[PDB]
Amino acid sequence: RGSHRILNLVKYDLYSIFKSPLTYLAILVVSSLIATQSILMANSMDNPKHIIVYGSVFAAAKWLLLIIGLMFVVKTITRDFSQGTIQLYMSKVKTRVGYIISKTISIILISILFALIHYVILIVVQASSNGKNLAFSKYVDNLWFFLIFLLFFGLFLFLITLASQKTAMIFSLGVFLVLIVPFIKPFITFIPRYGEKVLDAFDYIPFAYLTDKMISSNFDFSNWQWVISLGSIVIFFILNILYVAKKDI
Amino acid sequence: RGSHRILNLVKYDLYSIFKSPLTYLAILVVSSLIATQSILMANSMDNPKHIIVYGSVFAAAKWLLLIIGLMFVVKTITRDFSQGTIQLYMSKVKTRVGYIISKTISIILISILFALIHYVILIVVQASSNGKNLAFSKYVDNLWFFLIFLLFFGLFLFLITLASQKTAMIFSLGVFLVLIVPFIKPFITFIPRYGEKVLDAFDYIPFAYLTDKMISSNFDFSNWQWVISLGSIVIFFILNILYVAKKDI
Amino acid sequence: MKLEHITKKYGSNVVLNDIDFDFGDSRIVGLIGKNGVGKTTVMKVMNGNIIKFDGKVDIDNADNIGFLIEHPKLYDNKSGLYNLKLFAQVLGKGFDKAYTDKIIDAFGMRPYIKKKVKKYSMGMKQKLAIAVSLMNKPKFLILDEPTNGMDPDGSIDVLTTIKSLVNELDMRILISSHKLEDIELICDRAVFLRDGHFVQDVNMEEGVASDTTIVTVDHKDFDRTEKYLAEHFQLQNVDKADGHLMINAQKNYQVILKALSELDIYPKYIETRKSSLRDTYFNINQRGDK
Amino acid sequence: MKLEHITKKYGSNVVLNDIDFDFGDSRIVGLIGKNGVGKTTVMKVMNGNIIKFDGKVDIDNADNIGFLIEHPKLYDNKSGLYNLKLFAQVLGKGFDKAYTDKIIDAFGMRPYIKKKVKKYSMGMKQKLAIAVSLMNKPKFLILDEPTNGMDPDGSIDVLTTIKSLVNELDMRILISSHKLEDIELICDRAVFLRDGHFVQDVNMEEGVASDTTIVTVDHKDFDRTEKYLAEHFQLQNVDKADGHLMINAQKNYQVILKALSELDIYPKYIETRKSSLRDTYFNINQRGDK
After folding, report:
1. Which domain holds residue A204?
2. Which residues of chain C make contact with A90, given a CB cutoff of 8 A?
3. Would you report the helix, strand and coil content of chain B in percent, each value rounded to 5?
4. Contact between chains at C253 and D261 (C-beta distance less than 8 A)
5. Which residue range(s) make up the domain with C246?
């Protein structure tokens, strides 16, 4: 039935993730880099009695793991469109809808697993050193932020990959969308006489603040901001079902 | 005649080089980046009397242009191998040798054109600003360095792509070999009780010092280094000719 | 599965113009037409890849559809058993060990079933694709040239195996492909597509085959011979470019040969043979090329 | 292009075993075998791609070689005219407008010769590949499955154009392709590849002794018919009790019936028994499968 078709598609997507060696090469490289950076920064400049603050490691590990997880999600989304096996899944309407459902569920499962991985890396780094332990609420709301970011970008890239059916554009567009705004703001926003106006107007464009809040080691959202983010995710999801059920290949 | 076969392959390869929009997107981006960095760092970091130091512009322009000319050579040499049209060329021994000669001549002309581009960019920067001009012998030595570096790396990658017949692998190994050693060296050489010994032994392996002196603002060589580098280029050329006349698809 | 008054158009261009289709008491059906006339458009419309139908399609939910279109779609990176298992779970009701063992054993893919698909050849990929198509356990099977690059023995073996499976499972097949002599071997009925319509529908069940006699002659004499033979006998088919005229089966050649001798026209070659789809296909479609 | 005592081995797998080949008074030759027997290996040896021949090849430097191997190889981002100009400058002596325009016009790709190859179809790219092969000004043309993605009338048109260029300009063609019924229309000789050797070579004009032509005549005409056939051609079997005369196969029946109509003789029946490449190939290849 539909339940079996969704669970087998999510299960096979998970199986495909757990078998490739690039996943364990990425975790090894990130963990090695993060450990080297944390030890080098804490053991050499000021030279305290081995006190370590965890905000810098939190932010750095979060940013590196997110950019890799974004690429992993884009790869999972565009696998069938690259190989052309997508033409096998667009036979009827219930299968065409279950495909989108299964992709969303796979994104949720990868995000939950990835949050667990982030938990393991941060617990072992904290366990090795000594200092002031963090709180559970930080990890829980961090998990929520992980979910929100990955869902928003995965659905947006899902819509673009359905419209264009080209893969090299998705990879380049995803890299561009995540990485262009932090690069452009210092070199361009301080110039205009309209900059303060543009900065106030930045609270409603989803791209600017989702990318902006990436560097910070804690996220803070207003009620209006939360409302607009959930409304935007719902509109993209509804639009995806409508366009996938109305596009002709 | 063999002369028309060789000149037409180098000429049409060169024509495909001069007729793309990415070539001008790349020149515009690099020129904008180099001009912004030099102007920003020189006109306000100590409030001088608008004096500009040319070492940073030399090194930065040199680094970007080498990494771009290297990728342009890799793309140029692997275009035909990517689509498999090389099967149409590996027919008789005379064409199989003329192919390699044409590829070498294409490498020489791409290097000369990029050297002229570097010269034009530097002449414009010198024309706009105020300071003390450089010397022509520096530019001639710069031309020679461009030739040796590009020839060496192109022949190495030609041998690797002949052995492997994979194009993604070439792109990864080329980027890996150029950018990993200067990045890896500070974090590892100063550590052992063998670093000085390996450092003295570092003057004979071609890879380490050819890539190391790429980001330097000065470049001078000894006789043994010159003979070893030229001999390595010649041996690679002879080995390539021997493999191209003996490999079977 | 029936189609009624289907009309699909691309801008000003019209591809299908009020076509109809139905499996009426027929088990294997062949689809014949030229290149780029809209045969693949018909397969995508029939299978379900196209929603802007502009007709009525009567299908049941309990019946599955397994298909083969333009090129095989497979996971090149993974293995044959992974592909087989994945398409049985994701597309079919489940994975059946006895059923899968029987299909692999009947097709003969067991020696190379555990080696990677990227090490396969072209025919190997089509044979695996046919097994993947049957993996859904469908009620309707639509195939776009399944035997493109195979030797005659291999084509005979694959079609014979497919025919025996048409009895093992309650199956109904539509095959669109060129090289019609392979088609005439195992098919009960063929449909011909021209200008977006099914112009002719020849059905063959028993081997009576409506035997015919072929008379070949040059153009300057072909005009007179067609008129004279139409005035005397009943004429079945004509090909103007080659001067090929195909009257029905005549046991005695004496009255025709005597009449053509006093008529001064003479044939280049005379034989009697069962009519076929090569004759019908060329008769219908030689008017546009020359 | 000749091979004398050629043997090639891959490890423990023997692909070629002492094969000889020679163009003796023939223009079009066909190569027939199964898949993976080493046909493409023969093509590569015949082309120049393989280097370890283990034999002798005698080639004059003045003769040019043009070839097409399994799928077209082209530059995707660039146009067809760019491909034509490039392969004319690189492989041939140069580029000439009259020769290229005549080639382009006869094949029929003029409306879309300035369109991008990325938008072409499979048959259009195959035809363009054949044109690229002709751009070389070759003395020998070697084509590997030139007719796989096109419909029968298009295939016939391509083959007719190929033979026509064989006649206006001196070319020798080697064709290996399936759908052997299309090859048998226009071909001069065929070679069959089995177990690493060229097992059979058949020249169809001269025939084989198994081909027969059956002529049935009246009782009164038997003496005169036998006299005429004894004067003109070879007679194999004569049966007075049957009334049947067997003569050597003739493609055209005009002269035969002219002579009999001049002697007031009208045959009861005429038919020919011949072995085609499908019949011969199946009879030879049934020896290892059945």
Report:
1. 2-244
2. 48-49
3. 80, 0, 20
4. no
5. 1-290
